[PDB]
Amino acid sequence: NQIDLNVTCRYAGVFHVEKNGRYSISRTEAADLCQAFNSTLPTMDQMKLALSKGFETCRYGFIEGNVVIPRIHPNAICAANHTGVYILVTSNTSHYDTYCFNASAPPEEDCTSVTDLPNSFDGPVTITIVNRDGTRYSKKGEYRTHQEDI
Ligand SMILES: CC(C)N(C)S(=O)(=O)N1CCNC(=O)C1
């Protein structure tokens, strides 16, 4: 019973989380997942400030109200070459990655690794945080509060 959470650098407290190496998070799961990192789904304003500090990914993820990809450099296979916070307009499907916002993180680029899941609750799942540099942190617990996400 294992969940892998790949996480990024934080930029003005905003970071990206990919679960089990594929688009697999619902909107309800995303809010609960960010809560386990003492975080919330970013507002569009929080995500735009993160973008301005150096944040970009090539993956769709939830923010408050939309599913987006922050882009700095145009890349044909990432948000169809767009720059800025690209907003997903048309999709048949409901599962993506998520972004999270932690107000206590540094104001600009923080590319240190994540070494905790501070607000997970008791549960049976081995949850592993995987950093981009491969370093890992694991803990037994649960973060999903909605049965349909389990
Ligand atoms: C921004 C996230 C990824 N964190 C660095 S953390 O979840 O590990 N954590 C550290 C302790 N207290 C917190 O609010 C957050």
mmCIF file of C-alpha atoms in Angstrom, residues 16-105:
data_model
loop_
_atom_site.group_PDB
_atom_site.id
_atom_site.type_symbol
_atom_site.label_atom_id
_atom_site.label_comp_id
_atom_site.label_asym_id
_atom_site.label_seq_id
_atom_site.Cartn_x
_atom_site.Cartn_y
_atom_site.Cartn_z
ATOM 1 C CA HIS A 16 4.147 20.886 -8.077
ATOM 2 C CA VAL A 17 3.183 17.387 -6.874
ATOM 3 C CA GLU A 18 2.822 14.376 -9.231
ATOM 4 C CA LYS A 19 1.293 11.209 -7.709
ATOM 5 C CA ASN A 20 2.504 7.732 -8.784
ATOM 6 C CA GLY A 21 4.132 9.028 -11.958
ATOM 7 C CA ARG A 22 0.931 9.712 -13.832
ATOM 8 C CA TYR A 23 -2.024 12.135 -13.888
ATOM 9 C CA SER A 24 -3.948 10.586 -10.980
ATOM 10 C CA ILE A 25 -5.256 13.280 -8.653
ATOM 11 C CA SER A 26 -8.901 14.481 -8.417
ATOM 12 C CA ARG A 27 -9.782 18.034 -7.317
ATOM 13 C CA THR A 28 -10.896 16.746 -3.873
ATOM 14 C CA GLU A 29 -7.724 14.700 -3.467
ATOM 15 C CA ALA A 30 -5.618 17.701 -4.463
ATOM 16 C CA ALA A 31 -6.937 19.893 -1.639
ATOM 17 C CA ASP A 32 -6.337 17.072 0.886
ATOM 18 C CA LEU A 33 -2.858 16.397 -0.483
ATOM 19 C CA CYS A 34 -1.821 20.058 -0.178
ATOM 20 C CA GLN A 35 -3.247 20.076 3.382
ATOM 21 C CA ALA A 36 -0.803 17.257 4.277
ATOM 22 C CA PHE A 37 2.053 19.676 3.371
ATOM 23 C CA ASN A 38 0.372 22.470 5.518
ATOM 24 C CA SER A 39 -0.483 23.996 2.125
ATOM 25 C CA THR A 40 -3.443 25.041 0.015
ATOM 26 C CA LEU A 41 -4.240 25.063 -3.700
ATOM 27 C CA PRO A 42 -2.557 28.231 -5.024
ATOM 28 C CA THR A 43 -4.654 31.195 -6.125
ATOM 29 C CA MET A 44 -4.039 32.385 -9.699
ATOM 30 C CA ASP A 45 -2.262 35.470 -8.193
ATOM 31 C CA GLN A 46 0.021 33.225 -6.071
ATOM 32 C CA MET A 47 0.825 31.077 -9.146
ATOM 33 C CA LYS A 48 1.589 34.201 -11.298
ATOM 34 C CA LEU A 49 4.049 35.439 -8.642
ATOM 35 C CA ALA A 50 5.690 31.975 -8.525
ATOM 36 C CA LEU A 51 6.012 32.076 -12.353
ATOM 37 C CA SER A 52 7.749 35.471 -12.126
ATOM 38 C CA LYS A 53 10.333 33.979 -9.688
ATOM 39 C CA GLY A 54 11.311 31.120 -12.072
ATOM 40 C CA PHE A 55 8.573 28.449 -11.794
ATOM 41 C CA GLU A 56 7.644 26.386 -14.844
ATOM 42 C CA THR A 57 6.548 22.759 -15.375
ATOM 43 C CA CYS A 58 5.347 20.699 -18.353
ATOM 44 C CA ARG A 59 2.363 19.138 -16.486
ATOM 45 C CA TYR A 60 -1.273 20.066 -15.912
ATOM 46 C CA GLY A 61 -2.172 20.595 -12.291
ATOM 47 C CA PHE A 62 -4.910 22.066 -10.129
ATOM 48 C CA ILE A 63 -4.885 25.528 -8.686
ATOM 49 C CA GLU A 64 -7.940 27.192 -7.059
ATOM 50 C CA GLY A 65 -10.558 27.378 -9.817
ATOM 51 C CA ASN A 66 -8.573 26.045 -12.794
ATOM 52 C CA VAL A 67 -6.116 23.435 -14.137
ATOM 53 C CA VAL A 68 -2.919 25.101 -15.413
ATOM 54 C CA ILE A 69 0.682 24.796 -16.610
ATOM 55 C CA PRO A 70 3.092 27.650 -15.655
ATOM 56 C CA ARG A 71 5.420 28.315 -18.591
ATOM 57 C CA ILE A 72 8.458 30.585 -18.938
ATOM 58 C CA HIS A 73 10.146 29.254 -22.074
ATOM 59 C CA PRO A 74 8.139 28.376 -25.176
ATOM 60 C CA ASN A 75 8.245 24.633 -25.828
ATOM 61 C CA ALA A 76 6.087 23.048 -28.550
ATOM 62 C CA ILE A 77 5.137 20.019 -26.394
ATOM 63 C CA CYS A 78 4.392 22.025 -23.192
ATOM 64 C CA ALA A 79 1.114 23.980 -23.297
ATOM 65 C CA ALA A 80 1.300 24.291 -27.115
ATOM 66 C CA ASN A 81 4.289 26.713 -27.040
ATOM 67 C CA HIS A 82 2.518 29.245 -24.783
ATOM 68 C CA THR A 83 4.155 31.280 -22.019
ATOM 69 C CA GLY A 84 2.586 32.576 -18.792
ATOM 70 C CA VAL A 85 0.137 30.615 -16.627
ATOM 71 C CA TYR A 86 -1.521 28.498 -19.366
ATOM 72 C CA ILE A 87 -5.100 27.606 -18.518
ATOM 73 C CA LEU A 88 -6.563 24.265 -19.647
ATOM 74 C CA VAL A 89 -9.846 25.077 -21.438
ATOM 75 C CA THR A 90 -11.148 21.816 -22.944
ATOM 76 C CA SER A 91 -10.683 18.305 -21.635
ATOM 77 C CA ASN A 92 -12.907 15.259 -21.321
ATOM 78 C CA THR A 93 -11.135 14.064 -18.126
ATOM 79 C CA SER A 94 -10.876 14.959 -14.466
ATOM 80 C CA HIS A 95 -7.519 13.744 -13.062
ATOM 81 C CA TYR A 96 -4.328 15.798 -13.157
ATOM 82 C CA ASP A 97 -1.306 16.586 -10.961
ATOM 83 C CA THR A 98 -1.625 19.373 -8.355
ATOM 84 C CA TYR A 99 0.081 22.556 -7.344
ATOM 85 C CA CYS A 100 0.282 23.545 -3.632
ATOM 86 C CA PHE A 101 1.146 26.775 -1.830
ATOM 87 C CA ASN A 102 2.939 26.970 1.547
ATOM 88 C CA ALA A 103 2.908 30.414 3.091
ATOM 89 C CA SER A 104 5.919 29.713 5.349
ATOM 90 C CA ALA A 105 8.269 28.771 2.472
#
